[PDB]
Amino acid sequence: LQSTFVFEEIGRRLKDIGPEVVKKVNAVFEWHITKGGNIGAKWTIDLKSGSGKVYQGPAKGAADTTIILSDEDFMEVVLGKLDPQKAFFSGRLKCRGNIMLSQKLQMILKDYAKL
Helix, strand or coil, X not given: CHHHHXXXXXXXXXXXXXXXXXXXXXXXXXXXXXXXXXXXXXXXXXXXCCCCEEEECCCCCCCCEEEEEEXXXXXXXXXXXXXXXXXXXXXXXXXXXXXXXXXXXXHHHHHHHCC
């Protein structure tokens, strides 16, 4: 899965900027990455305590938001070739739980990308 490279890099960036992202976001994000409709991976991005964590599988607890899309679409969002808002409104990006926590996440990771 191309998206794996991406979650690992997030995990690595948290080892530095973890605490400031936790304070801004305070929430747990679960991901379901598909290949051909079959889920190929589940990742959790915890941003609730400490530096945050990135691990594989579902949330140890309740996820505040569960995001579902294909590996390939995940990559287009990361690479800026696809607006995640447009993807959501076209139905290629599914989003369960606290929907406005995901734009809260988006904005804040966008910020630390410009470093």
